[PDB]
Design an enzyme around this catalytic site. Structure first.
Site, PDB file in Angstrom:
ATOM      1  N   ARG A  15       9.222   6.347 -42.582  1.00 41.54           N
ATOM      2  CA  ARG A  15       8.348   6.796 -41.908  1.00 41.54           C
ATOM      3  C   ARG A  15       8.849   8.110 -41.129  1.00 41.54           C
ATOM      4  O   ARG A  15       8.346   8.867 -40.615  1.00 41.54           O
ATOM      5  CB  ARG A  15       7.675   5.821 -40.804  1.00 41.54           C
TER       6      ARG A  15
ATOM      7  N   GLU B 255      14.919  -1.601 -53.853  1.00 43.08           N
ATOM      8  CA  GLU B 255      13.491  -2.011 -54.466  1.00 43.08           C
ATOM      9  C   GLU B 255      13.947  -2.079 -56.233  1.00 43.08           C
ATOM     10  O   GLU B 255      13.438  -3.077 -56.698  1.00 43.08           O
ATOM     11  CB  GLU B 255      12.736  -0.981 -54.311  1.00 43.08           C
TER      12      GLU B 255
ATOM     13  N   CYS C  15       6.552   0.284 -43.619  1.00 39.00           N
ATOM     14  CA  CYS C  15       7.387   1.551 -44.367  1.00 39.00           C
ATOM     15  C   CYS C  15       8.508   1.863 -43.621  1.00 39.00           C
ATOM     16  O   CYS C  15       8.361   2.021 -42.316  1.00 39.00           O
ATOM     17  CB  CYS C  15       6.329   2.740 -44.380  1.00 39.00           C
TER      18      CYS C  15
HETATM   19  C1  HEM Z   1       9.297   9.378 -48.666  1.00 42.74           C
HETATM   20  C2  HEM Z   1       9.999   8.139 -48.683  1.00 42.74           C
HETATM   21  C3  HEM Z   1       9.496   6.890 -48.524  1.00 42.74           C
HETATM   22  C4  HEM Z   1      10.329   5.828 -48.453  1.00 42.74           C
HETATM   23  C5  HEM Z   1      11.839   5.821 -48.708  1.00 42.74           C
HETATM   24  C6  HEM Z   1       9.168   4.509 -48.451  1.00 42.74           C
HETATM   25  C7  HEM Z   1       9.921   3.359 -48.545  1.00 42.74           C
HETATM   26  C8  HEM Z   1       9.085   2.232 -48.637  1.00 42.74           C
HETATM   27  C9  HEM Z   1       9.467   1.125 -48.647  1.00 42.74           C
HETATM   28  C10 HEM Z   1      10.863   0.457 -49.179  1.00 42.74           C
HETATM   29  C11 HEM Z   1       8.556   0.037 -48.681  1.00 42.74           C
HETATM   30  C12 HEM Z   1       8.473  -1.416 -48.923  1.00 42.74           C
HETATM   31  C13 HEM Z   1       7.703  -1.752 -50.171  1.00 42.74           C
HETATM   32  C14 HEM Z   1       7.556  -2.960 -50.780  1.00 42.74           C
HETATM   33  O1  HEM Z   1       8.674  -3.832 -50.536  1.00 42.74           O
HETATM   34  O2  HEM Z   1       6.448  -3.476 -51.294  1.00 42.74           O
HETATM   35  C15 HEM Z   1       7.318   0.834 -48.314  1.00 42.74           C
HETATM   36  C16 HEM Z   1       6.007   0.415 -48.105  1.00 42.74           C
HETATM   37  C17 HEM Z   1       5.103   1.180 -47.581  1.00 42.74           C
HETATM   38  N1  HEM Z   1       5.190   2.533 -47.323  1.00 42.74           N
HETATM   39 FE1  HEM Z   1       6.755   3.752 -47.659  1.00 42.74          FE
HETATM   40  N2  HEM Z   1       8.134   4.862 -47.967  1.00 42.74           N
HETATM   41  C18 HEM Z   1       8.186   6.380 -48.223  1.00 42.74           C
HETATM   42  C19 HEM Z   1       6.837   6.975 -48.199  1.00 42.74           C
HETATM   43  C20 HEM Z   1       5.681   6.603 -47.879  1.00 42.74           C
HETATM   44  C21 HEM Z   1       4.474   7.457 -48.041  1.00 42.74           C
HETATM   45  C22 HEM Z   1       4.413   8.704 -48.253  1.00 42.74           C
HETATM   46  C23 HEM Z   1       3.513   6.586 -47.584  1.00 42.74           C
HETATM   47  C24 HEM Z   1       2.042   6.803 -47.273  1.00 42.74           C
HETATM   48  C25 HEM Z   1       1.578   8.066 -47.151  1.00 42.74           C
HETATM   49  C26 HEM Z   1       4.042   5.299 -47.382  1.00 42.74           C
HETATM   50  C27 HEM Z   1       3.255   4.223 -46.975  1.00 42.74           C
HETATM   51  C28 HEM Z   1       3.740   2.818 -47.090  1.00 42.74           C
HETATM   52  C29 HEM Z   1       2.736   1.612 -46.840  1.00 42.74           C
HETATM   53  C30 HEM Z   1       1.461   1.686 -46.714  1.00 42.74           C
HETATM   54  C31 HEM Z   1       3.598   0.818 -47.245  1.00 42.74           C
HETATM   55  C32 HEM Z   1       3.442  -0.760 -47.322  1.00 42.74           C
HETATM   56  C33 HEM Z   1       3.006  -1.111 -48.819  1.00 42.74           C
HETATM   57  C34 HEM Z   1       2.598  -2.603 -48.949  1.00 42.74           C
HETATM   58  O3  HEM Z   1       2.452  -3.308 -48.031  1.00 42.74           O
HETATM   59  O4  HEM Z   1       2.745  -3.101 -49.965  1.00 42.74           O
HETATM   60  N3  HEM Z   1       5.543   5.356 -47.594  1.00 42.74           N
HETATM   61  N4  HEM Z   1       7.744   2.155 -48.183  1.00 42.74           N
HETATM   62  N1  LIG Z   2      11.277   2.050 -52.386  1.00 44.21           N
HETATM   63  C1  LIG Z   2      10.292   2.478 -52.082  1.00 44.21           C
HETATM   64  C2  LIG Z   2       8.735   2.816 -52.053  1.00 44.21           C
HETATM   65  C3  LIG Z   2       8.572   3.988 -51.478  1.00 44.21           C
HETATM   66  C4  LIG Z   2       7.208   4.542 -51.428  1.00 44.21           C
HETATM   67  C5  LIG Z   2       6.181   3.777 -51.350  1.00 44.21           C
HETATM   68 CL1  LIG Z   2       4.677   4.332 -51.296  1.00 44.21          CL
HETATM   69  C6  LIG Z   2       6.436   2.377 -52.029  1.00 44.21           C
HETATM   70  C7  LIG Z   2       7.680   1.980 -52.393  1.00 44.21           C
HETATM   71  O1  LIG Z   2       8.126   0.668 -52.585  1.00 44.21           O
HETATM   72  C8  LIG Z   2       7.035  -0.034 -53.258  1.00 44.21           C
HETATM   73  C9  LIG Z   2       7.634  -1.666 -53.857  1.00 44.21           C
HETATM   74  C10 LIG Z   2       6.427  -2.518 -54.130  1.00 44.21           C
HETATM   75  N2  LIG Z   2       7.166  -3.417 -55.110  1.00 44.21           N
HETATM   76  C11 LIG Z   2       6.448   0.648 -54.577  1.00 44.21           C
HETATM   77  C12 LIG Z   2       5.156   0.655 -54.445  1.00 44.21           C
HETATM   78  C13 LIG Z   2       4.437   1.167 -55.539  1.00 44.21           C
HETATM   79  C14 LIG Z   2       5.140   1.957 -56.628  1.00 44.21           C
HETATM   80  C15 LIG Z   2       6.619   1.778 -56.412  1.00 44.21           C
HETATM   81  C16 LIG Z   2       7.014   1.005 -55.804  1.00 44.21           C
HETATM   82  C1  LIG Z   3       7.032 -14.389 -47.958  1.00 43.72           C
HETATM   83  C2  LIG Z   3       7.544 -13.133 -47.624  1.00 43.72           C
HETATM   84  O1  LIG Z   3       6.478 -12.544 -46.944  1.00 43.72           O
HETATM   85  C3  LIG Z   3       7.580 -12.194 -48.956  1.00 43.72           C
HETATM   86  O2  LIG Z   3       8.388 -12.973 -49.901  1.00 43.72           O
HETATM   87  C4  LIG Z   3       8.195 -10.715 -48.474  1.00 43.72           C
HETATM   88  C5  LIG Z   3       9.385 -10.764 -47.576  1.00 43.72           C
HETATM   89  N1  LIG Z   3       9.849  -9.491 -47.177  1.00 43.72           N
HETATM   90  C6  LIG Z   3       9.538  -8.273 -48.250  1.00 43.72           C
HETATM   91  N2  LIG Z   3       9.848  -7.034 -47.774  1.00 43.72           N
HETATM   92  C7  LIG Z   3       9.406  -5.885 -48.417  1.00 43.72           C
HETATM   93  N3  LIG Z   3       9.532  -4.721 -48.435  1.00 43.72           N
HETATM   94  N4  LIG Z   3       8.580  -6.304 -49.742  1.00 43.72           N
HETATM   95  C8  LIG Z   3       8.251  -7.531 -50.077  1.00 43.72           C
HETATM   96  O3  LIG Z   3       7.511  -7.920 -51.061  1.00 43.72           O
HETATM   97  C9  LIG Z   3       8.647  -8.567 -49.187  1.00 43.72           C
HETATM   98  N5  LIG Z   3       8.255  -9.895 -49.686  1.00 43.72           N
END
Ligand code: HEM
Ligand SMILES: N#Cc1ccc(Cl)cc1O[C@H](CCN)c1ccccc1
Ligand SMILES: C[C@H](O)[C@H](O)[C@H]1CNc2nc(N)[nH]c(=O)c2N1
Ligand code: HEM
Ligand SMILES: N#Cc1ccc(Cl)cc1O[C@H](CCN)c1ccccc1
Ligand SMILES: C[C@H](O)[C@H](O)[C@H]1CNc2nc(N)[nH]c(=O)c2N1
Lengths: 411, 411
Positions: free
Chosen positions: A112, A286, A109
């Site tokens: 954070r 995203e 994330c």
């Molecule tokens: C408030 C603004 C927030 C921003 C801008 C933000 C942004 C992001 C972004 C860009 C990612 C990458 C997601 C991906 O590529 O799939 C991410 C992943 C994550 N965020 Fe945040 N986040 C926010 C809030 C939160 C909140 C509120 C939580 C939990 C309470 C959170 C939990 C996580 C977790 C667990 C991941 C990993 C998700 C995964 O592995 O697929 N984030 N976040």
């Molecule tokens: N940007 C962003 C973002 C912000 C907060 C969280 Cl929890 C997740 C975020 O990105 C992920 C990207 C996964 N493809 C997300 C997860 C769930 C709904 C929509 C977007």
């Molecule tokens: C193989 C690699 O782990 C994958 O394609 C990753 C790269 N970095 C990333 N970074 C974010 N935030 N979300 C993703 O889905 C991915 N995909």
């Protein structure tokens, strides 16, 4: 001891102590180390009880003004609770703490810095899928806030024996359907092809559009999942337009304002919460880079290129880099125009760096997965790229789960 | 068994077998696992002999038409050689094989499709720093080829006791000096500040420019290093110009055509070659993004922004993304115009993907460090971003070394 960490951009050095509180295959998306799978029986006392004590200690140790009497009394109560019942119940205050800590400990994330700013909806008393649906609606409504996006979490009942799990079968609270067309083509979100089929197979009426909001597939108390349409007034959308290209609107692009994760598991002091949907606000790249430009998604790059009048057949021209930036300014501009919270990747990178610095000062570390934290576009032009990071699993934590349909025993 | 690897862009799956032939802290630049440090005594027979046999087997096993008689005879000879002398000498053919294999096994190299195309200069008979200098000049000359860049490697004598090491104190064969100015400012390459001082401290006359080519600092047979100026006719440069912005030339930017690593160690069958300079050809983003835009380097982003008439004070404007692309087309255009080999990051990504596919078919794997392989700009717009990778150390391999000045015993 410590692990020496270098920021190559500023030459700055940090010493990681925090990794000692932890629990190459780094480029794997869903590694088993990041997954918390199903259970047939409750968690053994031998593993539950020490985890529980550590959480209670962490909770009480977080207090600015320590309360030893309460701490030891709670330690005593919890121990007695686990030894006699085989489990335990958190206080609301402990749950609120757990949700923020788990976010603080999310290595993937970038948002954070916000970790302490989280609204917690306690739905631990929930019993039916209809009640789950009502909790999800209230969450969508609160979080959306007419585009003034607020981070929230809905905590459903904790796993008991593992045969009564509450689960959200969706990836996300809001997401578009993806259809395999008779033409051989794919319509909408190619990433939801399998899950869209699951919904159709469970009685969902597919509207066969490019931006069809998927239904909620809710599993309460281990029962078979139930399908629910999200009330459309609850789904806020941003229509895509470029501040200079009038033809951008003609692409007919839109995206939902709410990024909400539906499928993760919250681990806290031995307790597992397999249904705990949460959200933040979007980071532009995203939608603009991943959602619009991946071949596995909406795949719009070539069309934006042609319309910009570029050499779409010569890679060396850098037409892809040229197009992606316009898509990104469009996403940013459109969310800004429509009064919906969005953050550009440059501002987010700087924010995370400030957070990380605060985290080393506050606790001697910040678990961080570089591969995820570095924006999908403009990597080195970003401070996080030059920052050396340590990736480790602390507790409380948000784990992935095995897709519910793969382990569910039907009725 | 195998490790299942997913390419999320194409949905494609691969099974890694090769990781079994191997020998989180993934975002660390110079981890100890990637370093091969100094020695006071030759390598123990217990570790040398098994490594040697494995190499001989790998060498003979690579033959399209197997030669069992020669294989067993060589196995016998090498064993007898190590048991009686405490070491062994490779054949030229074995050395050529080792250099390509080590390149094939470089997890951080995107240019690996080229692995079999390498010119090998055998300088194992070298005894003096003046002879080292002559070998380096011949290498620069051959590799440069008037801009038609050729990949080459010069292999200097292997480590014996570790008290007679041949070393190139430079990071790279060609690199610019970096000066701390009286003004508090930095002139030229901020990344070579310490090494520039070392050269000055060893009698190099600093010309105090922005693009001063650093001298060769050569250590032969464990002796104190000697300073040598690279003959300027050997240093090919590309002057930076934009195909549309006439003012780009006014920035007064240039870069050397030759990307040559000077400081790595080649490990082969227990043998260590602490001096083995090698080169390929440039990938545009290395000069354009890293060399020109890092704050720790030439740091030109803001100036290119202002000159494009952009909102240099609002990050949300995406001015940085806009500027970086122009710098990148300038780099590409300038190398093209001046008939110097260069590869754009998009073409390189596709090439690596083809290579990786060939590698899984040929040997069930490809060691790959995602953090390094993904271009510093436009990540997801690139196929390698969506590719899951396994990073492991095979043999032969190119290791990092501890900076020579930190361990050298002077005279
Ligand atoms: C408030 C603004 C927030 C921003 C801008 C933000 C942004 C992001 C972004 C860009 C990612 C990458 C997601 C991906 O590529 O799939 C991410 C992943 C994550 N965020 Fe945040 N986040 C926010 C809030 C939160 C909140 C509120 C939580 C939990 C309470 C959170 C939990 C996580 C977790 C667990 C991941 C990993 C998700 C995964 O592995 O697929 N984030 N976040
Ligand atoms: N940007 C962003 C973002 C912000 C907060 C969280 Cl929890 C997740 C975020 O990105 C992920 C990207 C996964 N493809 C997300 C997860 C769930 C709904 C929509 C977007
Ligand atoms: C193989 C690699 O782990 C994958 O394609 C990753 C790269 N970095 C990333 N970074 C974010 N935030 N979300 C993703 O889905 C991915 N995909
Ligand atoms: C022929 C064209 C080549 C291309 C386009 C290429 C490109 C690259 C690039 C872009 C990097 C990233 C470098 C960095 O960010 O520091 C790299 C690293 C590397 N390459 Fe290649 N390469 C080529 C040839 C070679 C050759 C000929 C060898 C060895 C014989 C080689 C060995 C390596 C090694 C060892 C690394 C890692 C260097 C480090 O860790 O600092 N490459 N290569
Ligand atoms: N691009 C590129 C590239 C190609 C081949 C090799 Cl060996 C290295 C390369 O890049 C590295 C970048 C390190 N900052 C490099 C190494 C040595 C000299 C110049 C450039
Ligand atoms: C901390 C991180 O390891 C570091 O800044 C990396 C990121 N990826 C890279 N990738 C390449 N090719 N070269 C580099 O120098 C780096 N720097």
């Amino acid at each position: 001891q410590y692990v020496r960490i270098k920021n190559w951009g500023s030459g700055e050095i940090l010493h990681d102590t925090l990794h000692h509180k932890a629990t190459c295959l780094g480029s794997i998306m869903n590694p088993k180390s990041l997954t918390r799978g199903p259970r047939d029986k409750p968690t053994p006392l031998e593993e539950l009880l020490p985890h529980a004590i550590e959480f209670i200690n962490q909770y009480y140790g977080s207090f600015k003004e320590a309360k030893i009497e309460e701490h030891l009394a709670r330690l005593e109560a919890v121990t007695k609770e686990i030894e006699t019942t085989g489990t335990y119940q958190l206080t609301l205050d402990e749950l609120i703490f757990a949700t923020k800590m788990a976010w603080r400990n999310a290595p993937r994330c970038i948002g954070r810095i916000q970790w302490s700013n989280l609204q917690v909806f306690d739905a631990r008393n929930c019993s039916t899928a209809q009640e789950m649906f009502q909790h999800i609606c209230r969450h969508i409504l609160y979080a959306t806030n007419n585009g003034n996006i607020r981070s929230a979490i809905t905590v459903f009942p904790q796993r008991s024996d593992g045969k009564h799990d509450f689960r959200l079968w969706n990836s996300q609270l809001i997401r578009y359907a993806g259809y395999q067309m008779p033409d051989g083509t794919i319509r909408g979100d190619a990433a939801t092809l399998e899950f869209t089929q699951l919904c159709i197979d469970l009685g969902w009426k597919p509207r066969y559009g490019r931006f069809d909001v998927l239904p909620l597939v809710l599993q309460a108390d281990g029962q078979d999942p139930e399908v629910f349409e999200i009330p459309p007034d609850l789904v806020l959308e941003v229509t895509m337009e470029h501040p200079k290209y009038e033809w951008f609107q003609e692409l007919g692009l839109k995206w939902y304002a709410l990024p909400a994760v539906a499928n993760m598991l919250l681990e806290v002091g031995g307790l597992e919460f397999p249904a705990c949907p949460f959200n933040g606000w979007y980071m532009g790249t995203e939608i603009g880079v991943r959602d619009f430009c991946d071949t596995q998604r909406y795949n719009i790059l070539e069309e934006v290129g042609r319309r910009m009048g570029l050499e779409t057949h010569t890679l060396a021209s850098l037409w892809k880099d040229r197009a992606v930036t316009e898509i990104n300014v469009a996403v940013l501009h459109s969310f800004q125009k429509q009064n919906v919270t969005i953050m550009d990747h440059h501002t987010a990178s700087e924010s995370f760096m400030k957070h990380m610095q605060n985290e080393y000062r506050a606790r001697g570390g910040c678990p961080a997965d570089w591969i995820w934290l570095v924006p999908p576009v403009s990597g080195s032009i970003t401070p996080v790229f030059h920052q050396e990071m340590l990736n480790y699993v602390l507790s409380p934590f948000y784990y992935y789960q095995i897709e519910p349909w793969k382990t569910h025993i039907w009725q």
